[PDB]
Amino acid sequence: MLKGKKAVVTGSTSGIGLAMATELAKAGADVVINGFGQPEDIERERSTLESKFGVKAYYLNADLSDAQATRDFIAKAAEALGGLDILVNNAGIQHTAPIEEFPVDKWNAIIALNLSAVFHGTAAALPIMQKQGWGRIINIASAHGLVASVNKSAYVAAKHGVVGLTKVTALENAGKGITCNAICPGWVRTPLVEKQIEAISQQKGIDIEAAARELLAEKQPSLQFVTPEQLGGAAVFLSSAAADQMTGTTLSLDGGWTAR
Amino acid sequence: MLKGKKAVVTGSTSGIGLAMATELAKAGADVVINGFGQPEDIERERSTLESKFGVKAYYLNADLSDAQATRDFIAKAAEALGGLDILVNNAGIQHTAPIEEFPVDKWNAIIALNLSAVFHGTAAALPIMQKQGWGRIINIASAHGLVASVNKSAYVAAKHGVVGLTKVTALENAGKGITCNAICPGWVRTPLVEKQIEAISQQKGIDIEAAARELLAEKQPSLQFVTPEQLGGAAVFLSSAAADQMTGTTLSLDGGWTAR
Amino acid sequence: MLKGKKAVVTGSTSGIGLAMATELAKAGADVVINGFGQPEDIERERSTLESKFGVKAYYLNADLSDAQATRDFIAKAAEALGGLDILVNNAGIQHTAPIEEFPVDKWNAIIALNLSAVFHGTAAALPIMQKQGWGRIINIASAHGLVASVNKSAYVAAKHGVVGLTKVTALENAGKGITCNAICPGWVRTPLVEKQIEAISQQKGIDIEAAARELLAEKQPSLQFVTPEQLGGAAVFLSSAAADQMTGTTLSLDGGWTAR
Amino acid sequence: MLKGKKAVVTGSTSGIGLAMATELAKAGADVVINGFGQPEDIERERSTLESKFGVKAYYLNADLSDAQATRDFIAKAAEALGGLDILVNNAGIQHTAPIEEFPVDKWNAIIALNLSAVFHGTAAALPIMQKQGWGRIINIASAHGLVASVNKSAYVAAKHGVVGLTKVTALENAGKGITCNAICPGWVRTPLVEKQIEAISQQKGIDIEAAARELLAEKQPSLQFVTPEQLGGAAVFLSSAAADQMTGTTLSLDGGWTAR
């Protein structure tokens, strides 16, 4: 249980982050959610976190590609919650092209969100965690923070950067009651992956499900997707006392991707 | 909860393995324990697992440096339990000396227990897990399965070997309902470490506690020991559904050792 | 020998890059040099590459923190040389502070030079290498592309990013006659390190040389600096036929830093 | 040049080790060769090292699965050469089967040769290198010292062990003029691989060359074999002064295998 904890999840209006926020609320944490989407859907998400799980939930819209807006988001989140105990740096985007064709603005947008926002969000959260002597920073990296694939230069660079940044954060705060770790998923069937499944299905002249199977066979030896729910369980474990001496490391849920 | 699971923990009469067995029993698993020590202490351990936690517990004495005895141990364990769902390959030993002074019999004894027993125990358990379509093999490696220190050639080689073997096990059994992962602890204050603390305290002319502090400062940025209880929580997480797609990987609880 | 090769070295007016350019010229390559410094020193560097080693050398001033200026640099370099066979992405900077005190403009400046310039320079070079069916991209990462230290968040993140980017580059160009690898130095006594040695000497109240010794003892088990000359030899090896199937990897010259 | 160096190559009657011995002799080192094969072929190998390259060469038959015979081999090699400057621990074997079917005697034979012989050979060589203040120990690991594949439990465990052991060796001897590094090849078309190519060709009902292509496509993004000659060049580089601060690390020549 994380009863009375105060949690922030970036990019929690979809996908993995939505499951992060749900599992943390189900464990008893109050939660700040964040991200884009349809306003009616976001408010139903917010209000149902409260009505299902009996916690407080707040939605703060911030485009975390802007540094100042990320730092201001953290301050607003902490004010809403009355503190900040668990920060999940989750928001991220993907774009695929070979390096020489890779758009300079997509490189800049993936580095800004997928790497720099993790730095700015961490910097703004740390003093709150340091003054209270307890904290969790849970960065959502990827198998692509440890290995590469073709056509994903910006994303692999950003995610490797998040793994490095996670290690620094942990070393700087070692013994202070604060841990920092990176969850590194393999394929999870969210919209970020569905786009790639569709691009495959068109490239190969096959249906969507045969395309999902080929996606998995290429990288993920279990031939099964990792689920958002499993990922939210991993974050609940990282938040637990058993994980008090787990810091500066990666937690790979990837169906065997990085074992080969 | 792991209610009704059937677990085996090698080297569970002391240290980390004793905490493994306790936490698994507290989660509801029946447990086979194993290892050396004083018979009165071992039977009190067995019987109190049952009387505290309401599970069945069995002690099977096997010296796991013998291959056949390890394979026969697994069969006897499975017969006792009526199955075998979770295998914790934990038993291990340490010896410190520079390579050119390192005793050939201590190299052979550390490779036999710390590496080969993990192979023989896995081989004997696998067909039971494959026929039922579910399993957990949890190997206790070390930070020394990922990095090295001086004077620990056999142990670092064995533990690196266990990390490799964990990856193979996971790949061969990917998608079958069986996962295999390696818990990689930093310093944990058990008798295996207390001996090194004492050797330090004599080398340096200092008390035991100043020696423990120097041990930690050299390797473990948190300056705190990892606890057996924390480690048993990590094994309970690896045994959970959230970890169904966590396979072939290492889970480092090391206070930041391997982040630097 | 690399007789008739055409090489580009970013940040080759000092330090490691100057030795890169020297060793490549001594192997027979024509060389483009780049970086800041005193104009008289830069022209003496250029002209002495030619007069000592009998190659052609060109100095192209570009601030590689600007993306367009990096891409325009590569085109100008290729025009100067009449081709582009070996690209050494070396220019980089350092800044030390804890995360919550780390200046947002220094994060942006280290990501721009130490990571994004490697991407833009690679993107501009690749089509030249792809059309000729031969190439070397040699990225200068760091031990800090594989592990972390305190107070170096931007730099560790950038260098991890360069290791990821090196892997992508290599995978996208596998079998085309082009390799991409990352040289990962430990401490090398250049101005980037001398500043840290001086900061230590002031923190500790000791002379500069005792400070250099403490720098080395903390991280580098050999207790000796890696030299720029050794690093230029590593790049000459990466450029050789023996390294035709060495791609997507790191080459650590770090006195044992990353072995522990 | 390695003029006047004294080198030992285990398992140098075939494959990679034969190329190791050739390249070292071509650089000017005297060489001890070792391994099984037809006596006429071994003596022609020995004598042609001398007659082509003008060095001294000696053949010492030792089965390095025996610890004492490995230690006695090193002493005999050093007596032959009048010293011992470069030790290449290369001899190794492979066997493929799933873990539960993997023969206990093949596990023991792969651990004995592929791991323990590297320990015994290193232990016997070290005091000779320590007394002279210079040495190279070059261990031939594999991509399978860093990642796994199915059906190769003993070999992946042994090779991971060699990577760990390489790190210890380097740390214990850091700053003494002795380095220890692991060359980690991807696929190299020697008899050890030809057997696997043939097993594939039968499994799939295809010719030998289509089977070699499928072997490469599964693991090695360049779609080209690494050559023994390239590997001997890597060992000649590790033996050079440029590599004086390269210690405790892996040098991957694997066509991109471990980048993904």
Ligand SMILES: NC(=O)c1ccc[n+]([C@@H]2O[C@H](COP(=O)([O-])OP(=O)(O)OC[C@H]3O[C@@H](n4cnc5c(N)ncnc54)[C@H](O)[C@@H]3O)[C@@H](O)[C@H]2O)c1
């Ligand atoms: N899906 C996978 O297979 C997979 C695998 C490994 C890692 N990841 C990572 O998991 C994380 C979540 O991805 P997902 O798959 O759930 O994707 P998703 O697209 O379903 O969700 C992305 C979330 O981030 C938000 N977001 C996007 N741009 C933003 C911005 N500028 N500011 C604030 N919020 C922004 C979106 O609104 C959404 O809430 C990402 O960091 C991604 O890199 C995903």
Ligand SMILES: NC(=O)c1ccc[n+]([C@@H]2O[C@H](COP(=O)([O-])OP(=O)(O)OC[C@H]3O[C@@H](n4cnc5c(N)ncnc54)[C@H](O)[C@@H]3O)[C@@H](O)[C@H]2O)c1
């Ligand atoms: N303590 C640490 O800091 C630390 C750190 C990393 C990894 N480890 C690993 O954790 C595991 C447990 O170690 P620990 O610290 O709890 O040590 P411990 O000495 O307290 O316990 C070792 C257990 O193994 C048993 N054992 C020893 N030889 C055996 C044999 N031949 N057959 C069967 N059982 C045998 C012992 O009786 C005991 O039950 C080992 O694999 C060790 O390598 C420990």
Ligand SMILES: NC(=O)c1ccc[n+]([C@@H]2O[C@H](COP(=O)([O-])OP(=O)(O)OC[C@H]3O[C@@H](n4cnc5c(N)ncnc54)[C@H](O)[C@@H]3O)[C@@H](O)[C@H]2O)c1
């Ligand atoms: N010195 C070390 O211990 C060490 C260790 C590991 C990695 N590195 C890396 O080695 C590389 C070279 O560093 P060094 O130690 O030789 O440092 P240095 O300071 O001596 O040289 C830096 C070079 O980069 C140039 N440069 C700086 N900003 C630039 C810009 N915006 N555009 C173009 N050129 C620019 C400088 O003018 C100079 O030529 C860097 O990537 C650094 O991160 C150094």
Ligand SMILES: NC(=O)c1ccc[n+]([C@@H]2O[C@H](COP(=O)([O-])OP(=O)(O)OC[C@H]3O[C@@H](n4cnc5c(N)ncnc54)[C@H](O)[C@@H]3O)[C@@H](O)[C@H]2O)c1
């Ligand atoms: N070929 C590859 O693709 C590949 C890839 C990665 C690593 N490796 C490693 O490279 C090394 C050399 O393998 P190779 O492919 O050249 O194989 P190879 O079979 O062609 O040569 C093996 C050499 O070891 C000798 N040898 C075998 N058993 C021995 C024993 N008990 N004592 C002494 N010598 C013995 C053989 O006689 C022969 O000289 C091995 O360590 C292997 O694991 C090979």
Ligand SMILES: CC(C(=O)O)C(=O)O
């Ligand atoms: C696996 C998935 C990710 O890393 O986010 C991707 O490659 O897009």
Ligand SMILES: CC(C(=O)O)C(=O)O
């Ligand atoms: C940390 C502890 C271990 O790895 O078991 C040791 O080095 O003895």
Ligand SMILES: CC(C(=O)O)C(=O)O
């Ligand atoms: C070692 C040196 C570097 O990585 O550039 C530094 O930490 O500054």
Ligand SMILES: CC(C(=O)O)C(=O)O
């Ligand atoms: C690649 C080759 C090796 O590692 O020796 C093999 O897997 O057999």
Ligand SMILES: [Cl-]
């Ligand atoms: Cl790929």
Ligand SMILES: [Cl-]
């Ligand atoms: Cl050490």
Ligand SMILES: [Cl-]
């Ligand atoms: Cl540090």
Ligand SMILES: [Cl-]
């Ligand atoms: Cl495989």
Ligand code: NA
């Ligand atoms: Na709280």
Ligand code: NA
């Ligand atoms: Na940002």
Ligand code: NA
């Ligand atoms: Na059961």
Ligand code: NA
């Ligand atoms: Na055994």
